[PDB]
Design an enzyme around this catalytic site. Structure first.
Site, PDB file in Angstrom:
ATOM      1  N   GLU A 176       0.803  -1.228   0.000  1.00 50.54           N
ATOM      2  CA  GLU A 176       0.000   0.000   0.000  1.00 50.54           C
ATOM      3  C   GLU A 176       0.837   1.281   0.000  1.00 50.54           C
ATOM      4  OE1 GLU A 176      -2.130  -1.076   3.504  1.00 50.54           O
ATOM      5  OE2 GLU A 176      -3.993  -1.621   2.463  1.00 50.54           O
ATOM      6  N   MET A 222      -9.157  -2.000   8.760  1.00 43.27           N
ATOM      7  CA  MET A 222      -8.581  -2.315  10.070  1.00 43.27           C
ATOM      8  C   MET A 222      -7.748  -1.218  10.729  1.00 43.27           C
ATOM      9  SD  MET A 222      -7.716  -6.302   9.264  1.00 43.27           S
ATOM     10  CE  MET A 222      -6.898  -6.534  10.866  1.00 43.27           C
ATOM     11  N   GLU A 223      -7.649  -0.048  10.107  1.00 46.43           N
ATOM     12  CA  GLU A 223      -6.776   1.002  10.675  1.00 46.43           C
ATOM     13  C   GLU A 223      -7.430   2.376  10.806  1.00 46.43           C
ATOM     14  OE1 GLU A 223      -5.565  -0.863   7.846  1.00 46.43           O
ATOM     15  OE2 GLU A 223      -4.706  -2.387   9.161  1.00 46.43           O
ATOM     16  N   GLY A 246     -12.552  -3.493   2.305  1.00 50.63           N
ATOM     17  CA  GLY A 246     -13.587  -4.470   1.961  1.00 50.63           C
ATOM     18  C   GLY A 246     -14.864  -3.723   1.650  1.00 50.63           C
ATOM     19  N   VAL A 301     -12.863  -9.109   7.551  1.00 54.03           N
ATOM     20  CA  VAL A 301     -14.271  -9.497   7.481  1.00 54.03           C
ATOM     21  C   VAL A 301     -14.542 -10.353   6.253  1.00 54.03           C
ATOM     22  CG1 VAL A 301     -16.658  -8.702   7.475  1.00 54.03           C
ATOM     23  CG2 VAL A 301     -14.816  -7.335   8.596  1.00 54.03           C
ATOM     24  N   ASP A 319     -11.779  -6.373  -2.348  1.00 50.34           N
ATOM     25  CA  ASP A 319     -12.654  -7.499  -2.055  1.00 50.34           C
ATOM     26  C   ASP A 319     -13.996  -7.024  -1.520  1.00 50.34           C
ATOM     27  OD1 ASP A 319     -12.558  -7.745   1.139  1.00 50.34           O
ATOM     28  OD2 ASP A 319     -10.513  -7.369   0.444  1.00 50.34           O
TER      29      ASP A 319
HETATM   30  C1  LIG Z   1      -1.944 -10.725   4.573  1.00 55.31           C
HETATM   31  C2  LIG Z   1      -1.766 -10.092   5.942  1.00 55.31           C
HETATM   32  C3  LIG Z   1      -3.116  -9.857   6.620  1.00 55.31           C
HETATM   33  C4  LIG Z   1      -4.013  -8.963   5.772  1.00 55.31           C
HETATM   34  S1  LIG Z   1      -5.247  -8.226   6.786  1.00 55.31           S
HETATM   35  C5  LIG Z   1      -6.158  -7.146   5.732  1.00 55.31           C
HETATM   36  C6  LIG Z   1      -5.416  -5.818   5.594  1.00 55.31           C
HETATM   37  C7  LIG Z   1      -5.937  -5.055   4.378  1.00 55.31           C
HETATM   38  N1  LIG Z   1      -6.577  -3.836   4.913  1.00 55.31           N
HETATM   39  C8  LIG Z   1      -7.817  -3.455   4.204  1.00 55.31           C
HETATM   40  C9  LIG Z   1      -8.868  -4.506   3.946  1.00 55.31           C
HETATM   41  C10 LIG Z   1      -9.185  -5.041   2.702  1.00 55.31           C
HETATM   42  N2  LIG Z   1     -10.209  -5.938   2.779  1.00 55.31           N
HETATM   43  C11 LIG Z   1     -10.640  -6.057   4.043  1.00 55.31           C
HETATM   44  C12 LIG Z   1     -11.671  -6.839   4.761  1.00 55.31           C
HETATM   45  N3  LIG Z   1     -12.486  -7.701   4.099  1.00 55.31           N
HETATM   46  N4  LIG Z   1     -11.771  -6.651   6.104  1.00 55.31           N
HETATM   47  C13 LIG Z   1     -10.980  -5.790   6.797  1.00 55.31           C
HETATM   48  N5  LIG Z   1     -10.018  -5.047   6.218  1.00 55.31           N
HETATM   49  C14 LIG Z   1      -9.832  -5.151   4.869  1.00 55.31           C
HETATM   50  C15 LIG Z   1      -6.818  -4.026   6.360  1.00 55.31           C
HETATM   51  C16 LIG Z   1      -5.665  -4.915   6.783  1.00 55.31           C
HETATM   52  O1  LIG Z   1      -4.527  -4.072   6.958  1.00 55.31           O
END
Ligand SMILES: CCCCSC[C@H]1CN(Cc2c[nH]c3c(N)ncnc23)C[C@@H]1O
Ligand SMILES: CCCCSC[C@H]1CN(Cc2c[nH]c3c(N)ncnc23)C[C@@H]1O
Lengths: 229, 230
Positions: free
Chosen positions: B12, B174-175, B78, B153, B198
């Site tokens: 990012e 998440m931030e 998301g 999620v 997603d």
């Molecule tokens: C591979 C290591 C772990 C990845 S955890 C997901 C990342 C991407 N960020 C955004 C993010 C996209 N989709 C999401 C979803 N469905 N739920 C919640 N956060 C998101 C939040 C977090 O920093």
């Protein structure tokens, strides 16, 4: 230098009015009180409530005062069967009860880029156990402490936490943020809190009535520990 | 004049990182701060790391040590709004903790004790984003509520929980609420400008893996323009 952190005014008042040559520095909703408690360099942070306030406060604490150790003081919701109000809880380790990144193989409560759990410092746990021998009539339990951005007071949330963290002795809302931040800074920490409630239908009123006791019990434990280093 | 830019992941931050001129790099508390300029504008890019604690810690450091004048949260998200597809852009009108619950004490759902129920994005920053979008035809955008929690999620149950308490959620990550809340406490203006990777369902892990590059590109183009306009 001993870093000491509590969320609420009530949790930090008993230690605050015991330090001498107090230098009050309030910034970004936090208040830092620095000075001496019977000849020991301390810094008392009042962080405010929850995980974000705690992390922000702990980050400011460590970057600007460089304490040698961190002690998290205050109240907690009891899960261990033996705990009554006023009883002390000492962290062996800390986990986010509300972190869930399992979709990528992380175990429940483990945040991405972090350990599954944050382990309290071995010296500090020893030092809390010694301080406990100084308070003969207080009962204490040592174990897993779980934190989340929720006040736990429903059957269904208590059940969620017990499931994923069978060993939990107690619950609160700042410890894992303190611990994780200390981990990322490589600073030793321990949590030493006291029980205000047992995280059920009655905890709002129990917390109501027994937060003062919890802060007295907790602050006495921390007052001892201070001397022991 | 100085712009703070915060992304959680390396993916990012990489695009904006390669554009900073006379970069100076600091590695503190598992965070990394890239300061310098982009087309004449003083900026500081932070890679916070994932989750609310990292985000908060990083943001506190960023503000206390670099005093940026504004903060822009960049990265993936998301999608919850139905009109959103992968790579589409999401701009915060406000930010809330979807995982905060102190209702036992008279607070509304998602409101942390001692905090506003929601953290309102800076009007001027919203405007600047809207103008930055006017440059990018073929990117669909949505302005609205962004919810943060310490969870990826990807189940219908979490999704239902969140839509039931935050009916107007446009997007989830998440931030943002950790950044927004620490900005509030510091009295620093913020805006979240992210893109979709997603749709927060059973398929979101692979979806995320596949389209994180796209969302980074999509989100980064938005922030670049904004830097220009600021
Ligand atoms: C591979 C290591 C772990 C990845 S955890 C997901 C990342 C991407 N960020 C955004 C993010 C996209 N989709 C999401 C979803 N469905 N739920 C919640 N956060 C998101 C939040 C977090 O920093
Ligand atoms: C109106 C004021 C709002 C009170 S929010 C609860 C305070 C007390 N702290 C510890 C704490 C005791 N009992 C608990 C329980 N059942 N669940 C979770 N945390 C706890 C954490 C947080 O700083």
């Amino acid at each position: 230098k001993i870093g000491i952190i509590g969320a609420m005014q009530q949790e930090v008042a008993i230690l605050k009015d015991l330090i001498e040559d107090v230098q009050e520095v309030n910034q970004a909703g936090c208040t830092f009180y620095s000075g001496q408690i019977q000849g020991v360099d301390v810094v008392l942070l009042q962080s405010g409530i929850g995980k974000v306030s705690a992390a922000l406060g702990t980050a400011l604490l460590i970057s600007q005062y460089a304490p040698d150790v961190v002690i998290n003081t205050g109240s907690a919701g009891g899960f261990d069967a033996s705990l009554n109000v006023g009883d002390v809880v000492i962290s062996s380790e800390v986990r986010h009860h509300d972190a869930d990144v399992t979709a990528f193989g992380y175990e429940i409560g483990q945040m991405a880029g972090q350990p599954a759990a944050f382990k309290a410092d071995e010296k500090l746990m020893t030092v809390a156990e010694q301080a406990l021998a100084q308070l003969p009539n207080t009962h204490a339990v040592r174990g897993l402490i779980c934190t989340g951005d929720a006040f736990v007071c429903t059957a269904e949330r208590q059940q969620f936490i017990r499931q994923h963290f069978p060993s939990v002795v107690a619950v609160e809302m700042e410890a894992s943020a303190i611990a994780q931040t200390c981990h990322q800074f490589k600073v030793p920490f321990v949590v030493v809190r006291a029980i205000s409630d047992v995280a059920d239908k009655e905890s709002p009123l129990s917390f109501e009535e027994f937060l003062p006791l919890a802060a007295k019990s907790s602050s006495a434990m921390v007052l001892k520990m201070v001397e022991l280093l």
